[PDB]
């Protein structure tokens, strides 16, 4: 009754019993199923293990304000649509800014937005839309704003309100193939924390300036809960003030550790043809000749999945 031999037998019996990856082995580099929505953040993409949000699963993305959570999610929408997908936004914060969005690749004019009047309302006009089997992705804004009917009328539900909608709506988008993004902001999240298949921790680390007015910021995302690929991985990226995730910038951060670029004297170089000094000067260099940037994305998309 060899150890390893006895382990895998009882172990595989679980996936059968409770789910695909109820018991994951942190090192395993397993890859199967896929069906993901790029987050336009290569880095983060790998972090997930399958290169993007698994479609057909409830995802949580918490983090304090200004953190860039919305941005990520929106990015998720650009992609989800830039591939013929139908997006649904359940605005309950009413903070959304179109101009910024449209600058990320979102097809606003063909985006579903809805501003419910009560917690219940939101959780239905959403669940309903999911059962319509038309949406590819659907974010809901601010788990918090989802206040029970009362507490708006007369006078803890919510911890209950959320629970219900989930049990129902988890099965629904489960065989619909429509990924549901929720958005926390450090209640009901005591259940979302248990339904979500992937919960993200978005929190702003640094600030990306150049003796200028600062602009964006280096964001750190730690994927504390994952059920498709192994959990706990993490990745950082740049978010430019009014422009979004620095695909180019992310391309250098990743193109330097992976050994596809070299930094001799703070002087960037991609195999014999230098890029410039500093970072803000290099991302500016790729932002031009996309064929050069394309190779690197095409190169890192090889070193890994
Ligand atoms: N009113 C604005 N004007 C110009 N750029 C903005 C504005 N709001 C956000 N941005 C851009 C630059 C900020 O660094 C970046 C922050 O990420 P965002 O996801 O928009 O914050 P957030 O999701 O953590 O806070 P919130 O809870 O308000 O949504 O988005």
From Swiss-Prot:
GO terms for biological process: DNA recombination; DNA repair; SOS response. HAMAP family: RecA. The keyword Repeat does not apply. It comes from the Bacteria. GO terms for cellular component: cytosol. It is found in: Cytoplasm. It holds the Pfam family RecA_C. InterPro entries: AAA+_ATPase (IPR003593), DNA_recomb/repair_RecA (IPR013765), DNA_recomb/repair_RecA_CS (IPR020584), P-loop_NTPase (IPR027417), RecA-like_C (IPR049261), RecA-like_N (IPR049428), RecA_ATP-bd (IPR020588), RecA_C_sf (IPR023400). It comes from Mycolicibacterium smegmatis (strain ATCC 700084 / mc(2)155). Phosphate binds at residues 66-70, 185. Belongs to the RecA family. GO terms for molecular function: ATP binding; ATP hydrolysis activity; ATP-dependent DNA damage sensor activity; damaged DNA binding; single-stranded DNA binding. Keywords: ATP-binding, Cytoplasm, DNA damage, DNA recombination, DNA repair, DNA-binding, Nucleotide-binding, SOS response. Its main location: cytoplasm. Disruption phenotype: Not essential in the absence of DNA damage, its deletion renders cells much more sensitive to DNA damaging agents such as UV light, ionizing radiation, alkylating agents and DNA gyrase inhibitors and desiccation-induced DSBs. 5-fold decrease in survival, loss of HR, no change in NHEJ (non-homologous end-joining) or single-strand annealing DSB repair. This is Protein RecA. CDD domains: RecA (cd00983). The gene is recA. Required for homologous recombination (HR) and the bypass of mutagenic DNA lesions (double strand breaks, DSB) by the SOS response. Can catalyze the hydrolysis of ATP in the presence of single-stranded DNA, the ATP-dependent uptake of single-stranded DNA by duplex DNA, and the ATP-dependent hybridization of homologous single-stranded DNAs. Numerous X-ray crystals have been resolved under different conditions which indicate the flexibility of the protein, essential to its function. ATP binds at residues 66-71, 97-100. The keyword DNA damage applies. Polymerizes non-specifically on ssDNA to form filaments. Interacts with and activates LexA leading to autocatalytic cleavage of LexA, which derepresses the SOS regulon and activates DNA repair.
């Amino acid at each position: 009754p060899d150890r390893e031999k006895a382990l895998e037998l009882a172990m595989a019996q679980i996936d059968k019993n409770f789910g695909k990856g109820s018991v994951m082995r942190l090192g395993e580099e397993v890859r199967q199923p896929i069906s993901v929505i790029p987050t336009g953040s290569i880095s983060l993409d790998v972090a997930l293990g399958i290169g993007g949000l698994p479609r057909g699963r409830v995802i949580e993305i918490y983090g304090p304000e200004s953190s860039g959570k919305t941005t990520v999610a929106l990015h998720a929408v650009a992609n989800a649509q830039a591939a013929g997908g139908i997006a649904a936004f359940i605005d309950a914060e009413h903070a959304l800014d179109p101009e910024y969005a449209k600058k990320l690749g979102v097809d606003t004019d063909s985006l579903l937005v809805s501003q419910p009047d009560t917690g219940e309302q939101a959780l239905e006009i959403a669940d309903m839309l999911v059962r319509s089997g038309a949406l590819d992705i659907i974010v809901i804004d601010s788990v918090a704003a989802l206040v029970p009917r009362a507490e708006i009328e007369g006078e803890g539900l919510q911890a209950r309100l959320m629970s219900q909608a989930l049990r129902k709506m988890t099965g629904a988008l489960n065989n619909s193939g429509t990924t549901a993004i929720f958005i926390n902001a450090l209640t009901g999240g005591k259940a979302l924390k248990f339904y979500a298949s992937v919960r993200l921790d978005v929190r702003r680390i640094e600030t990306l300036k150049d003796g200028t007015d600062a602009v964006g910021n280096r964001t750190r995302v730690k994927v504390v809960k994952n059920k498709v690929s192994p959990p706990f991985k993490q990745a950082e990226f740049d978010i430019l003030y009014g422009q979004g995730i620095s695909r180019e910038g992310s391309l250098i951060d990743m193109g330097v550790e992976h050994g596809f670029i070299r930094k001799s004297g703070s002087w960037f170089t991609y195999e014999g043809e230098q890029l410039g000094q500093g970072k803000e000067n290099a991302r500016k260099f790729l932002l031009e000749n996309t064929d050069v940037a394309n190779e690197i994305e095409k190169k890192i998309k090889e070193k890994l999945g």
